[PDB]
Each structure stands twice: as C-alpha cells, then as structure tokens.
Design a protein around this ligand. Structure first.
Ligand SMILES: *[C@@H]1O[C@H](CO)[C@@H](O[C@@H]2O[C@H](CO)[C@@H](O[C@@H]3O[C@H](CO[C@H]4O[C@H](CO)[C@@H](O)[C@H](O)[C@@H]4O)[C@@H](O)[C@H](O[C@H]4O[C@H](CO)[C@@H](O)[C@H](O)[C@@H]4O[C@H]4O[C@H](CO)[C@@H](O)[C@H](O)[C@@H]4O)[C@@H]3O)[C@H](O)[C@H]2NC(C)=O)[C@H](O)[C@H]1NC(C)=O
Lengths: 360, 362
C-alpha cells in the first residue's frame, strides 16, 4: 500500500554523499594553495640563481647560472599558465558541488523534520521506525551533515561521485505500487510529501500536472498514485539523459579537474642532457653539449652542486640594509630577493663603469 | 482561512535572488583572474627594469633602476600575499552562494511544479491564480532560473545580498492566521505543502514535532495550523539569531570579499619622495626621500615617467637571447622570454667584467 516514508536504503547513501560534499571546497582550496606554492618556488629559485650570479660575477659557473635562471623562469611561466588554465575548472567544481549539496540538504531536511505522530518521512526498513539523531549527530547511524562546516584547507574524500561516475546509490526502482522505495503503509504511519497525488499524497482533490524532480533529479515524486521513481545511474552522469542536470554537471566538473602533480608545475628530473627545458634555456641564452659543459656532468643530478652553492651563499648583515646574516637558500620573500638582486646589479654597474674608466 | 499557496510578494524576490546567484561564481572568477594579472604585471615590470640595467650598465639612471626593480619586487610580493589572503574568502563566497542557490532552487521547483487542478502552490495575488512560465521563461513575469548557467568570467550583479546585508525581500510576517504570506483560502484551491499540520497542510493525524526551516531558513513551515513565518531581516545577516545559517554565512563571506583595486595590488602614485615603498626600496638598496629625488632627477608626481618610458621603448634586436625578431622591451610579456633576456644580459655582464679585469691586469 502506498503512502509511507522513504526507505533508508535510498536516503542513507544520499546522506553520506551530502556529508562528503561538505568538505569539497576545502579540498579544492588546499589544491589551489599547493599549486601556487610550487609556482612561487620556481620564481624564487630564479631570483636566487640571479642573485648569486650578480653577487659573484667572476664565478666559474656563469654558464650554469644563466641556464638555471632561464630554466626557472620558464618553469614559473609554465606553472602560472597551468594555474590559470585550472582556475575555471576549480571554481566550477566548488560551485557545482555546493549547488548539488544545497539541493540535497533542502529536501533531506524537509523529510527529516517531517516527523511527529503519524508523520514518518525518513524511515529505516518499515513504515513505523522513523530516523532520529543520535548523541553523535548521526541519523539512524549515517553521517548526515545538512549544512556547511567552516572552510578549512584539508583533504576530504569524495567517493560517491568520481571521474568514473556515481556509485553506491540505489537506482531505477519505484514509480508504481511495488513498495521498492517506500515500505508498505500498514496503518496510521504516513508521509504525504512523497506522492503528488490525493489518494496517499499531498495533492488536493487529485494529482499535479506532471511528475516532480526532487533531490536535483535523483528521484521523481509522481503526479499519480505511485511511489517515487529513482533515476537511472546513467541519468546522473555526463552524457546521460535529462532530468538530473546538476548531477551530470558535477560529474563533468569532477572529470575535468586539473592534476596537482602535473608536469607543468614540477622540476624536471632526467639526465641533464635529456631535460627538454634545460636544453631550450641553454639554446636561447648560451644544446646538449652546452648544457653538459656548463654543469660538468651528463648525469641525473649534475645540477645539485651549483644548486647547493646558491642555497648556502652567505648574505652578510648590512647587505641591502639587512639586519642579520642569512643563507641565500632561506630568503623567501620577493621583496627581500628583489632588493638583493638590485643591490648586486647596482654594484655590478658601478664595477663596470669604474673598470671602463680605468681603461679609457 | 489557511491552506492556499504562497503569495508572489514572498517568492518573487526569492526567484530574483536565486537568478542572481547563478552568476556569482563567474564574477568571482573574473575578479581572481584580474587580480592575478596585476600581480604578474608587477613581476614583469621588475624584470624589464632589471633587464634594462643589465643591458646598459653605464646608464646614468642606475640608481633609479635599482629603486624601481626593488619597488616592483615589493609590489609583486605585496600583491601575491594579498591574493593568498583573499583566496579562502573567494572560495567560500563561491561555495556559500551556490549552496544557498541549491536550497532555494529545490524548494522553488517543488512549489512551482506542485500545480494542477486544485493544487496551486505559487500564486500571484489570490488563491486561484497560479504562476506559469511565459515564452521568455519568466515565472509570472519574474526571472526564476532554477539551474546553473555555464561558468563564464563575466560581471554579474548580486544586489539582494551585499556588504550591508540583505535587501528587497519581505521579512517578519506570518506564522498564524492573518494571511500575510498566503491568501485566504476561498474554496477548492489549495497548497498542502506550506503547513506541516493536518487541518490545512500535509500532516497526517496531527502536526510534526517542530517548525521546519525551508528556503534554507528564510521561512518556517509551521508544525501547527498556521501559515509560514518569514525570518526577520537581522536573522539573515551576520550576527543574527538562529534558523538561517546559510544566509548569515553568505553575508559574512560577501562582507569579507577582496578589493580588486586594493592598494596592495596597484602602483603607488603621488610625489616620489612620499611613496612609502619607493622610499623603503631606496633606503634598503642605496643606504630616503633625498636618495629618491637624486636618482630620478625630479620630485614631481611623474618623476619616474622618464625612466619607465626608456625601459618600455628599449629595442631588443633579433638574435638577442636567440629571439627571432626585433621588439620593444615594453611589449615582451612572458616570464620565459623576460627571464631568458635577464639571463642573457647577466651573462654578458659577467663576461664584460672578466674581460675588463684581464685587460687591466698589471
Ligand atoms: C625546483 O628546484 C629548486 C632547487 O632545488 C627548488 O628551489 C629551492 O626551494 C626551496 C624551497 O622550496 C628553497 O629553500 C629550501 O627549502 C627547504 C624546505 O623548507 C620547507 O620545509 C622545511 C622543513 O619542514 C621548513 O623548515 C621550511 O620552513 C619550509 O617549510 C629547506 O629545508 C631548506 O633549508 C635548508 O637549506 C638551507 C640553505 O643551505 C639551510 O641553511 C637549512 O638549514 C636547510 O639545510 C638543508 O640542507 C643542509 C645541507 O645539506 C642539510 O644539512 C639540512 O638538513 C637541510 O637539508 C631551504 O630553505 C631553496 O633555497 C631553493 N633552492 C634554490 C637553489 O633556489 C624549487 O623549490 C623546486 N621547485 C619546485 C616547484 O619544487
């Protein structure tokens, strides 16, 4: 018999999903912050190499330093372009996930609170057992957080919707008299919200004009005397039919998320002669032979020696009006690094003019 | 008499608001993109001034170039820090705005589609006139887009919720038998969804346990024989009471939105000797106001315009850093290209220094 509440095998998974959506924005924020940290790491590595070269013009490693500054600049530009390419996709995943969560929280809340006396709209396995909150704020043992927690950059698993599509939900069933999604109405227990018709639902004198999409289209409330009908799995996924656009758009948004470990953001690692962007830098500022001669190595790590020299270079108190000695590898603001490059570039200009005056 | 649909003076404004929320993400995207563009412009201006000094060691503007490079570096760091501080606020505004829109669209759709025969849940001015979609997809003359448009970085006004709070909605009314939010039920026309009670609503045998927040708390569906109760304006804003957290949290996020033309992102203006970060740059790389005036040869508001124009108009000939064509330095606008030019000329400086020292060797 029609007219009872919604079985937990249906809404339970929806509760778990909306609870996962709560943390999607914080996970995306964390990924954006980590991407920006890599780009800034490249930009600062460029300046440190440039500072070391300006500080030690007569260094025997000028060719290696010229290659490294040009390489880190390309890495900074390539990382910056990848971030701009990923930014619309990140925004939309935040937008689409929270929009779906708002749909689910509105209707889940309405059903959960439509409880009292005969009214039992979220039930477990039968018409008489209504869901209640436990001390741990679980709803009949399920996570069901129907609001947004404060934004925090921490990862949060999203397992009910992935690049592969939706999972762990019920599909297809209902839409008639089989009591597949609601238990048989055995007596006084009822939930008139789940049918848009007058016999066992909230319709007055008859049904509405046509079935109604709820849960952003995951479920249809019928305009006839019939229990709700669950959408097909493919209706919730990219390429599916109509009726659940918010689900498909979120799947698509998740499919198109950028890779946080993309090659465009990360230092190149191969043998120095195989490193494509090392070679391009050497080609433009000084190919293979030039790279390997500047670093005195064909190995995978022939750059570690000059890299360590840059990091450990001592910047004495008073250099660029600095208040204490520090290692160049620990200076990590653009203001400080830019002032050091300017200080040494100015010194070099005065060295050039003085030597040229002596020679003339 | 209780039991009719919802008056358009209530849902009309909610339809207009949810239509505005559709474009919030794109406006936020546009602002972030424009902010990143300013930061990148500072970084590239630093590189051009540094390239010009390296290319022209014998310039008479060496002190001015050292000041500008250090200044543009401070600007790039100051803009980057401002963007990183604004990024959580941007994410939350996107998250909170779309989350509220999802709430409003779910319930609006349910009421709009609960139409047919006696069922009339969104009405205009009386119990018998149900709202319908026109040719332009307006709902009884109102914009009511219950879905998200494709994301576009385009301006989109959000006027119903601002830094000052919410506006243009009805507040306070309802919660009993006065028919302030529903018209009096004259006959067969009905909407049982709007009261969680059995006399004129969808309750079975009695009311539910407690009033129910709908429209994310903008309105309460009553557990007693009573029409819905609209929240007070202050309950929808930062610092308000309970019942509409999704509204207060969106107001807060909007209050904390970043300024796209913030001082931290833009060039300093005015007399050179009064530009705080020009003065700080000069102090640190030269060892204040007097050093700045001497470097640029002026105290006017536009004392830096002469060296800035020299940088922009400097010719970079084909073959410099393996470049394939002549170009003005002010038109070179990638970090790869500018970084290869600075590297090329820094190397030239090293070789110029070594050659001069060997020539001069005693
Ligand atoms: C592409 O490749 C370049 C070159 O490798 C790289 O640039 C380098 O970036 C790092 C920053 O990412 C620069 O700074 C180094 O950063 C590490 C990590 O710092 C973080 O983590 C530590 C530990 O939790 C925190 O304390 C710190 O706050 C940060 O969160 C630091 O550990 C480094 O400090 C060491 O080196 C200093 C300079 O010599 C030392 O004085 C300091 O004590 C540390 O000593 C290290 O080396 C010692 C000698 O072997 C060893 O005994 C110690 O145990 C320790 O290992 C340093 O601050 C670094 O300067 C950059 N290098 C150059 C040449 O620019 C880019 O990051 C990379 N790009 C990407 C995107 O990955």
């Amino acid at each position: 018999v029609n007219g009872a509440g919604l079985l937990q095998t249906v809404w339970g998974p929806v509760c778990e999903l909306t609870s996962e959506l709560d943390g999607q924005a914080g996970a995306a924020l964390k990924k954006e912050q980590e991407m920006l940290a890599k780009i800034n790491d490249m930009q600062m590595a460029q300046l440190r190499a440039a500072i070391y070269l300006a500080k030690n013009p007569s260094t025997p490693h000028q060719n290696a330093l010229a290659v490294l500054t040009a390489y880190y600049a390309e890495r900074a530009g390539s990382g910056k372009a990848y971030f701009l390419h990923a930014l619309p996709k990140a925004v939309d995943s935040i937008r689409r996930a929270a929009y779906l969560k708002g749909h689910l929280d509105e209707y889940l809340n309405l059903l959960e609170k439509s409880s009292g006396g005969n009214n039992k709209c979220l039930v477990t396995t039968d018409d008489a057992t209504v869901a209640t909150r436990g001390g741990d704020q679980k709803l009949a043992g399920k996570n069901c957080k129907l609001s947004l927690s404060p934004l925090k950059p921490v990862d949060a698993a999203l397992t009910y919707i992935t690049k592969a599509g939706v999972g762990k939900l019920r599909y297809d069933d209902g839409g008639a008299g089989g009591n597949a999604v609601t238990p048989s109405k055995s007596g006084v227990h009822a939930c008139k919200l789940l049918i848009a018709h007058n016999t066992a639902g909230y319709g007055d004198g008859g049904g509405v004009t046509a079935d109604i999409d709820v849960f952003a289209g995951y479920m249809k409330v019928k305009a006839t005397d019939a229990e709700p009908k669950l959408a097909a799995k493919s209706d919730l996924e990219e390429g599916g039919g109509g009726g659940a656009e918010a689900w498909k758009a979120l799947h698509t948004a998740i499919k198109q998320e950028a890779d946080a470990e993309a090659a465009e953001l990360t230092n190149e690692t191969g043998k120095l002669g195989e490193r494509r962007h090392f070679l391009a830098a050497a080609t433009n500022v000084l190919g293979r032979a030039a790279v390997e001669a500047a670093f005195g190595s064909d190995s995978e790590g022939g750059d570690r020696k000059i890299i360590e020299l840059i990091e450990k270079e001592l910047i004495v108190k008073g250099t660029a009006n600095r208040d204490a000695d520090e290692s160049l590898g620990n200076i990590k603001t653009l203001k400080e690094l830019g002032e050091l490059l300017s200080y040494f570039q100015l010194k070099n200009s005065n060295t050039i003019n003085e030597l040229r005056n002596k020679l003339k």
